[PDB]
Amino acid sequence: SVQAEIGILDHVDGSSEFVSQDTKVICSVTGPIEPKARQELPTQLALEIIVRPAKGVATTREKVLEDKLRAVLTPLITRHCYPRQLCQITCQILESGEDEAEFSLRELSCCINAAFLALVDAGIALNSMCASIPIAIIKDTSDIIVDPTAEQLKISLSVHTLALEFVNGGKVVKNVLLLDSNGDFNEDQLFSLLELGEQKCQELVTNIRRIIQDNISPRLV
Amino acid sequence: STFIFPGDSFPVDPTTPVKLGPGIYCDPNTQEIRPVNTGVLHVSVQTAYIDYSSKRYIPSVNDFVIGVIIGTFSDSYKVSLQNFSSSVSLSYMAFPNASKKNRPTLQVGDLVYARVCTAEKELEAEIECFDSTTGRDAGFGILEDGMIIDVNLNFARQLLFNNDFPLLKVLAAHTKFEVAIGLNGKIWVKCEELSNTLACYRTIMECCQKNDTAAFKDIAKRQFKEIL
Amino acid sequence: DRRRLLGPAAAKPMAFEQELSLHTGFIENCNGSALVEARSLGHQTSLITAVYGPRSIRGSFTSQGTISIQLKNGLLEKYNTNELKEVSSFLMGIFNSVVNLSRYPKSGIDIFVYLTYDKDLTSQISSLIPHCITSITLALADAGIELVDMAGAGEANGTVVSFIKNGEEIVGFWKDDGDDEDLLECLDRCKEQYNRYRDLMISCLMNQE
Amino acid sequence: AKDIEISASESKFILEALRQNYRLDGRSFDQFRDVEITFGKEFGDVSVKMGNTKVHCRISCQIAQPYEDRPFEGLFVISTEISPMAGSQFENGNITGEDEVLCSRIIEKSVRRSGALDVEGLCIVAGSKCWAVRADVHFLDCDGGFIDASCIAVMAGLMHFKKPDITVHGEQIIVHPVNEREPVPLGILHIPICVTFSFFNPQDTEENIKGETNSEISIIDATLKEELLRDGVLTVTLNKNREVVQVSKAGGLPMDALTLMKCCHEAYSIIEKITDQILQLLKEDSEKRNKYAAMLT
Amino acid sequence: LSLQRANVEILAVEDKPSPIDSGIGSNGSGIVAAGGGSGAATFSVSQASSDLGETFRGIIRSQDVRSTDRDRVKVIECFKPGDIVRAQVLSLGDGTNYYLTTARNDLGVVFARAANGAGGLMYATDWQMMTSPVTGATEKRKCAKPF
Amino acid sequence: RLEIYSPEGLRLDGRRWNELRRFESSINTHPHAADGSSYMEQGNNKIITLVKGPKEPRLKSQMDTSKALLNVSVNITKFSKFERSKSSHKNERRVLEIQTSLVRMFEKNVMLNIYPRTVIDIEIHVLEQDGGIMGSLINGITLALIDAGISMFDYISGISVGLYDTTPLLDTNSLEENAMSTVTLGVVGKSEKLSLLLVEDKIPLDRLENVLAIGIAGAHRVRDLMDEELRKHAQKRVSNA
Amino acid sequence: SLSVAEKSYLYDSLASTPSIRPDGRLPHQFRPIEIFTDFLPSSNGSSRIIASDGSECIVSIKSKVVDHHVENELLQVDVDIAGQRDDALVVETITSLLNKVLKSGSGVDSSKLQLTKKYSFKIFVDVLVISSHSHPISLISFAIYSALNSTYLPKLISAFDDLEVEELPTFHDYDMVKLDINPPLVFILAVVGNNMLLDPAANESEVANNGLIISWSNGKITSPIRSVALNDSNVKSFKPHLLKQGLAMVEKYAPDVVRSLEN
Amino acid sequence: SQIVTPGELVTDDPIWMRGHGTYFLDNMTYSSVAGTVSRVNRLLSVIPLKGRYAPETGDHVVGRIAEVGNKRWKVDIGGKQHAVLMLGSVNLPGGILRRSDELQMRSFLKEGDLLNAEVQSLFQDGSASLHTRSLKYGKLRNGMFCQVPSSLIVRAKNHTHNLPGNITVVLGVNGYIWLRKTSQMDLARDSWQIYSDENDPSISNNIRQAICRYANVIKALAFCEIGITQQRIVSAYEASMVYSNVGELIEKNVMESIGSDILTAEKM
RNA sequence: UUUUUUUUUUUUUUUUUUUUUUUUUUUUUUUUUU
After folding, report:
1. CA-to-CA distance for B58 and B184, rounded, in angstroms?
2. Of C105, G14, G254, H54, which is the most buried if we count CB atoms within 10 A?
3. Does E94 reach chain C within 8 Å, measured CB to CB?
4. Which family is this protein grouped under (chain G)?
């Protein structure tokens, strides 16, 4: 299963921490605040996204992750409620949980989940809820594995990341926010993978709802 | 009454007209009512709103706030309500019995108690140092000396609007003090001796760190015993 | 490098007259462009130039326009930064005399030249200067920037001379190495090349309407 | 905005409380904050907590080539890049600003220049192959005192790290997997620890420069509110052999020399306790790992 | 917008786009401003005029909105952020802004959206009114004359 | 293997344990380039300091309505040592640290609050370098600032002391700085208060007060020399003009 | 910075027959300068030039022993100008020109740098400009000329032929040999209408139509010749007969400048 | 008087009132600059030996336009700050309120222009406010510009003088000097064209030669650190007629000789 | 004993890393108390 914690930093508007197997990410959110003159948008909210790796300095490998995170997060936020304001989102990877020289999908899923939790904790207006899982297809057996380990990634044939959008009590799928597939596959494998991923994402979003309700309710009267 | 999430079904009859409060959005394209915040939905000519946790203040008309003077212009002051936020403006004619000969004498770095009067979406918010709706002047103006405490918004609302919140009563049982409460997340206190003000500051910080209102008295007693 | 993929650190690099064609206006996202391609017996060259502007500029108010010229390598990195910048400065000096800069207050004009192709079919940067001048003139005319005259150049034994007004005036002089007593012959040869280049440029502008 | 605004009332209150021997959080003038150290699953993964300041460190290594000038040593580098996660007053890419440069230089002089790490033990084949060691510091939450927390975290992470065992097979080398041949630790020569002091002037400048009395105030390990109002700062590094590793007082409020010597003498009592605490925590972690490995037999 | 003036950016000079390349797609995915990406912090100031996607800027003062009653003009009852406005140049100004006017019948708002840019397009109905077709709501503008 | 301190009490260049090197300074050396200037010679060190301002700021962003902004720039040439430097020193972290230290030193001494909305620029060129360069930089800045007629509270004097086993040596050179640990000091006026204290190598804890006292006395002598030179120049200037 | 009226007045004065210069100088007359040499003891040679308007330059000469088969160029110049970036266009243009004027075959006698059949001296020229008000090519050239004529090099005392058996070069510990190489000079000229001017001032450069850079060596004009723009608001084209006039002017008046820099 | 240095004790008498250049602690007064002690009744202060020009009300100054702003200009006069010239402080050829001239300020004065002005008042920090509300002030033309240190300008009641050879000199208090051809207004001293950039089309060679000689002798006087006055300027101009070529006056020995001759003639 | 109120100015941040280098060498058997 997964472990998530809410509200752990003192000088930001919202924060969270997501753990899945051996992957660990901490995220923070500050906004809405005043932006720089070159970041300003006349009618909607602007975003500034930073991702930092576990070892070394940031390179072009983190730029792709920032691009995908920005693609996922833009339709989730009700951006027109905060004209010409800024929201800062920073993710720090503490433990990759995989071999960074070859794979980066577990980090992407963990960052997506942590950023959503921090956005909920901060108080930003959101259109709906989200959940993200990694998937792999293993050689020889040709079996589809949800949440693969680091050992199963080393003998895989294709790796996938799926992020979905849920409404109406976490029971209706509204859109596919991101699907990222790399490897070698045919159509039947793809349409089996989507069907399995939908159920796994539904279970994950139910669990996330329970965690959020447990954490937030004591703060209110 | 119930816990709600963004994207959930709104449990209100579409026929009955209901005025919308914070946390509820009307779609400009589909004309649909949906919630956008997480928390508890309260339904009271009836009004519905969602109570959610927050720390970043957004100006709203008829709110009591505490600000800092950060710049003086030809006709108004430049005022900050929170670090890293856009500033607001306070006009030289927004004081009681003000005229072009009776100018105000505030400096950069002063604390002020004011009310939000204009919060247009396309403009910069404005504040005034007197209640223009009623003509009353109840505590608005400069705050001399004292100390400032940062809290979250729900705590400040509980202090200002709930008379069954027991913090002020337990504080009054130890010392005499002055207080001003701002809905932007600021509390100002002052006592005759510095040790009493320090004890009040420590008590308020510790009480805000907690969520149980039944432990306030023990915290206050321990803190006021600490200063000897 | 945090912004580029340069590979492993321990790797080592592997160690082992003229006929012209002129065309303008083929790049979509700029204001003006030109392609110059010259061939002879023992040389072959291709060049592309692009003009951006007039555009906004950072700073205080200026009463006349500003010109910037950038030279870039192509395919093969045959020249280093210092000589490219020296040639850029020489070209900027030339083209500050022909552009009507008083017509463009508080604005800038940026010019880019790409050295795509240069092959020896059978002292090397000096012979490339005339084609750069021709390409920049063609691109500036294509973009609609006001010029008082058409500028050309010629090369002869390490000497480059640029002319206007039918070869009666000089806007640029360059000389490296060469014979010390050979000045009149160089001028005559450069002017002879300049006249042909001017004819070809005017024909290109007039035909391709 | 990126500017932290302080009102006149807050400044006056804090200075007057300092005049009456009061700190906002209830410490005395010479009291250091409590330190919590937690070790991760991997070797070289350490978390350090000092009240409200949180810092994370990670150690890693890989094969490289030695320098031509020095063919008998390995490579060591320390990276400390700050982000808006620790606070919205910090820029994302800023390695040229005053405070960042000062912190980087102080950490470099305390750890790498003092020779706390044995870089001659990182050589594999003299002149051709060696180890390159990295230390990455992550700043999570700022309540003052990044320098001390960073020094503690780097030293603890270096003392917790282990590198794989290798053997030389003719011309090339073989790096054994961890589940085969029991990775080995690094050699540490001494353990340096930094302490920071803050100075406040309860008078005007004329009294400080031409006055006879010395009424300046010194406190240890200031918080974020305190260090935004200070007039000077001093950092001193020491080890248990009574050696001054480095001293840095780069301008600020002029201070009498006897007070500075008193500060240097007060830092030693703190560093002794910190060193003992680190050693005890490392011993307990090693015993826990050995007991679990025995129980998993 | 403010109480004294409006700030605009120039998109076309006499039915010709300015600049030719707007920089779309240079900052990746999402909705980003021209100077809101990674390349804005590494632009060579001393080797060029301006960065990719930069435009000319202008200012409309409240006294220049119209030719009559130019002391009781309310800016937010004339323009909104995100509107397309046709104006005329008055002066070169300083190095940052031009000075513009709309005090003529053919100058003003030509395109606008309801709900401050979150809704659909509106159409001009009167000299000072626009109407939303989907829901018959009206807003106040300074409409440029069509046809 | 050399005799740093001989049994007869002599150093390698012939000095004794408490003697300064030759100290020569000049004032008003570049009248056409700056408001204040100085030329400093301390042993074999050669430094040129120029002070420009107070003046209008270049940009409207670097303007303060309550006080002036102070900037320091240090340039170390490639030919300042026996061996030519391979690359430039302009953007090294060491140079930035030196500049920040100097700015923070002189912020507290100059009365910046009586020149609001102005900027003061200090440019320094180091031509030759033979040990103890930080103290020479401090002395040159002090002389150039006083030559420009800018208000300040007192003098600041720089000095360096090396510790050789148990023997303190005053005003060390390059040979001594490569064989022992050194301490750099900045002293205010004729008091015991320190503006700068810089120790970069290991020193025993129970041997620092003696070094501090020796350095303080040396800095007092340096201040005396600077004051004498300034008074002599002023007397010559006012005698005829 | 000048106004329109000032520029018109100055241009009318300069472009007249005969020309009138603002300080009354003749068309070929130079301004006074001060020269100091041998003031950096750690260098092989040094100089400092101070102009009458405050311009100042400092030059240092240093040497190194290299293998002259791998090394192709034995003279290298590095230029630093205060207030300018290291990659500024004018800095790199001046660096390129100064390296071209001191190349292997240019009139510079590089045979005097040879020690042993395998090795040679490589000369490093470092230039620092403290203050300047116009194009400082000729000031730097004069400073380099002064510094190179007072340079001393170590004396070799360990063999000369080492093609077969090679020994490490070894030098005498006290004696040095004066370098007698032949350095060139670089002049800058201004074109104002139909007149040619030598050594132009800052205000004369703001109204000039164009400019020329001409090199000189041991009695003859040398290869590096360029046309240069001294301003950006008045640059125009010139007739070919002004080039010949400038070359003749430099040929006529260069020998007098040589005698002024002697000793 | 008495020379003092920063940090030096001036007096310990608790009877003096402290002025510029000093700071105090209780009854002890100190010096913050290098200079001389000055006493006026009970006021005690120190006058610095060196410093920039400090504007005073009523001063006659020469400056250059630096910035074109919002209904104002910025003028460089060589002080610590730029001066301010409001649009209402100048004379407009047509009028002020015609049913423009606020967006068209560059048609009158633009960046780089030289002008003649008077100091009207000082702001709180010492910056100056200028006005040009007389026919004797405005745009400068028909001549040449030169600069000397402001401490060498002797204080006087008049600052515009007519010199032999049809030359007029404007001696700025801040040290900025203008030499020009004498006009009708200058002779009489003893509408739309006041903002024109055109020079007189009839300036002869003799006037140019005279202006060159006057600039050379002014620079010679500044080299010897002699205060500049009208009488000294005329005397130095007349004594330099020995040299037929104006270009020989730029050598150091000639300048020193001219200065020494002036001083010797005055002292006799 | 009428009559006498004087108070000046300003708007939204300069662009590319950590390496930052001088005075000269050796030789064949455990453990404790001596």
Report:
1. 8
2. G14
3. yes
4. Belongs to the RNase PH family.
Structure determined via = cryo-EM
Q: What is the CATH number of domain G1-263?
A: 3.30.230.70
Give the C-alpha separation, G69 to F75, whole Å.
35
- Structural domains in chain A, CATH included, are 1-221 (3.30.230.70)
CA dist C159 and C191 (Å) reads 12
Closest CA of chain C from E75, distance in Å: 27
| A172-182 vs B2-4, strand pairing mode | unpaired
B59, B125 Cβ separation under 8 angstroms = yes
Q: Taking the domains of chain F in order of start, what are their residue ranges? A: 1-241
How distant is the alpha carbon of residue H15 from its chain centre? 39
Nearest to A68 by CA among A5, A132, A8, A17: A132
Q: How many CA atoms lie within 13 A of A191 on its CB side?
A: 3
Measured CA to CA, the distance from residue H9 to residue G255 in angstroms comes to 62
Neighbours of C184 (CB within 10 A): 10
Using CA atoms, how far apart are residues E75 and E102, in angstroms rounded to an integer?
Answer: 12
Length B42 CA → I25 C1' (Å): 90
Domain B1-54 grouped into CATH 2.40.50.100: yes
Token digits for E50?
Answer: 């301006």
**C-alpha span between B124 and E1 (Å, rounded):** 9
Q: Which CATH number fits domain B146-228: 3.40.50.1010, 3.30.450.40, 3.40.5.10, 3.30.1370.10?
A: 3.30.1370.10
> What secondary structure, in 3-state letters, does H206-250 show?
HHHHHHHHHHHHHHHHHHCCCCECHHHHHHHHHHHHHCCCHHHHH
CATH of domain B55-145: 2.40.50.140
CATH topology for the F1-241 domain: Ribosomal Protein S5; domain 2 (3.30.230)
Instruction: Give me the resolution in angstroms, 1 decimal.
Output: 2.5
* D260 chain-F contacts, CB cut-off 8 A: 194, 197
DSSP symbols for E45-80 = GGG-SS-TT---EEEEEGGGS-SSSTTS--GGGT--
Report how far residue A45's alpha carbon sits from residue A31's, in angstroms, rounded to the nearest whole number.
10
Best mutation target, D3, D85, D224, to test chain A (most A CBs within 10 A): D85
Domains of chain C, by residue range, sit at: 1-207
Nucleotide nearest to B78 (CA to C1'): I11
| Cα maximum dimension of chain D | 74
Instruction: State how many domains chain E has.
Output: 1
What distance in Å separates the CA atoms of residue H117 and residue A87, rounded to the nearest whole number? Answer: 52
Angle between helices A105-122 and A60-73 (to 10 degrees): 50
| A221 at interface of B, judged by CB pairs closer than 8 A | yes
Chain I bases having any atom below 7 Å from a protein CB: 9-24
Those residues whose C-beta lies under 8 Å from the C-beta of residue H155, and which sit 6 or more positions away, are H173
Is G54 exposed, middle or buried (CB count within 10 Å of its CB: 0-12, 13-18, 19+)?
Answer: middle
The strand pairing partners of D172, in sequence order, are D169
Contact B185, B152 (CB under 8 A): yes
Structure tokens at E24: 């779309």
- For C1-207, CATH gives 3.30.230.70
SS3 sequence of chain D:
CCCCCCCHHHHHHHHHHHHCCCCCCCCCCCCCCCCEEEECCCCCEEEEEECCEEEEEEEEEEEECCCCCCCCCCEEEEEECCCHHHCCCCCCCCCCCHHHHHHHHHHHHHHCCCCCECHHHHEEECCCEEEEEEEEEEEEECCCCHHHHHHHHHHHHHHHCEECCEEEECCEEEECCHHHHCCEECCECCCCEEEEEEEECCCCHHHHHHCCCCCCEEEECCCHHHHCCCCEEEEEEECCCCEEEEEEEEEEEEEEHHHHHHHHHHHHHHHHHHHHHHHHHHHHHHHHHHHHHHHCC
Nearest-nucleotide field for E43 (CA, C1'): I15
